[model samples]
Target chain A: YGNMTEDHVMHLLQNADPLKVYPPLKGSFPENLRHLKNTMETIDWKVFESWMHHWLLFEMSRHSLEQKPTDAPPK
Target chain B: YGNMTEDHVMHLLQNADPLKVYPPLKGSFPENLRHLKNTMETIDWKVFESWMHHWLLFEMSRHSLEQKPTDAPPK
Candidate 1:
């Protein structure tokens, strides 16, 4: 039950509080993001979240592979 | 030259067009985001961008390690 399975991890991620999760940043991180906001539209949370979810799934698949000993002996 | 180095990748991420980068989605991705917005404040681009930037750097470090042959022979 304490394992980091896809469903469990997804549940945790989905429930995660964005504001509480991030500490206020300083410098270019803020400046660069503001640059984007000025240059174009401010990004919506959905687009950002989905983009990350896709990559999270990608990394988790890699993690799952590492969990299994794919193969060892000559075969 | 083509590479996924920290500076180049950070530049790309900073300049990336949020709207163009994501294709419109239909499903839990959007639904989940809306839930957050309703629950709290809409996520600021700076916060999201910085959070991702931190992790992107984290992955790059791991990638850099993979590039080097740590140690091989008996030592």
Candidate 2:
């Protein structure tokens, strides 16, 4: 990848909206904690961490070139 | 939760720099892919996906409000 300008980086951040891209979980925190617990119980943590790194990279890449702003920047 | 204005959403996005937070994988793509495959083999895909969703939210939260850009925005 080419060197990314600070401006480009800012542009990227401006468009990112986690709630829009991935809806917030629909359950209680306790349920979510249990969900996290169950997955940890089912897999090796190191393996899970590695898998997560890859998945994060994938998500970031998906949104890297995802926007076009029509509005003028604040002066 | 309050309604998130597009401006606030953009501010959140501007500071979200992934590489600074998560260094790129040092290994070759094939090696990384193999690592991912090995993890997949060791766990249920559905379980993995759920765990990943939580992890992403965690990362996003960590980076939110993470920077104070001293420079003005692009004119």
Candidate 3:
């Protein structure tokens, strides 16, 4: 988990990922993991916010569809 | 393109569904969307912190295998 580069992270954002594991135990690793420790680092919450906007839309759409969608993502 | 690994990310794209349809204000959704928007007001940082750590774990694991053409899992 400690070996991924910043490039890989952006890659995963565009791509998705192989997975999500554990509950995230802190101080269990070494190095600049400080970024990981911060709840909302540069790309972290930004991505999560990116994720949230979508999540909320889907919930709305789900309610809208069953009731039933954002009119896809951004540029 | 540095020896990337392809996996289930596609599913995320499918589910996330960037855009599709637009929601109408035809339901009780007027106040509903507002409360939902307010949800951002509160959140669980500890939980997110854990997941962020996992993001680190995954890409890091991926890069090693991709870049190193790993013969083993441990560094």
Candidate 4:
């Protein structure tokens, strides 16, 4: 998925439609993979630190929420 | 939003009374708004790309910093 433009990804989203096909995979799609890959591809430690900060945000949000909450997302 | 989940449509973060009441409408609420009747909803491809890769990271990290232990999140 390196340097793959958004249009390039629209194909996967349009045809395969993973969310429709696999609801559990909702919210867990291209974003995570793309970000992770980008993080790995970078060499500059300066930029790398930025990636780490961004990652922690996502990680914390996920951790804050119950996996399958009886309740809803914080409103 | 089409499958409105993250509370933007509900004005979840909008001013209302619900303990843990949604504070400010800070970050762009949903990763992508899917308002069906609003199927026209499309993030500017380049702008969207920047948000996903750039702005979102900053927005996301700023959010996380509010919760970080040492105020350790990037300034």
Candidate number with the higher TM-score (2 or 4):
2
* Better-scoring candidate (DockQ), 3 or 4: 3
Q: Tens digit of lDDT per residue, candidate 3, span A1-75?
A: 444455565665646744432224355322112334243353653454434443433344235434433345675
lDDT tens digits, residue span A8-67, model 2:
544545477432221232565333333443434334323433344344434433333434
Question: Fnat of the models, one by one?
Answer: 0.00, 0.00, 0.02, 0.00
**In model 2, how large is the Cα lDDT of residue A42?**
34
TM-score per candidate: 0.21, 0.23, 0.23, 0.22
* Tens-digit lDDT track of model 4 for A1-75: 223333333332333232211111112224333443344234322343455555555465545444664656776
Per-prediction DockQ: 0.02, 0.03, 0.05, 0.04
* lDDT per residue (tens digit) for residues B1-75 in model 1: 223344554455557844323223243633533443343234542343434433432233223223434468889
Shift in Å, residue B28, candidate 3: 13
Per-residue lDDT of B61 in model 1 = 25
Worst 10 residues of 3 chain A by lDDT: A28-37
Rank by TM-score, highest first: 3, 2, 4, 1
Enumerate residue pairs that collide in model 1.
none
The alpha-carbon lDDT assigned to residue A62 of candidate 3 equals 36
User: How does residue A24 of candidate 1 score in lDDT?
Assistant: 23
**Per-residue lDDT of candidate 4, residues B1-75 (tens digit):** 124345643464344634333234333323232222123224333323333343333333233323423455788
- DockQ ranking, best first: 3, 4, 2, 1
Instruction: Identify the CAPRI category of the predicted complex in candidate 1.
Output: incorrect
Worst 10 residues of 1 chain A by lDDT: A18-27
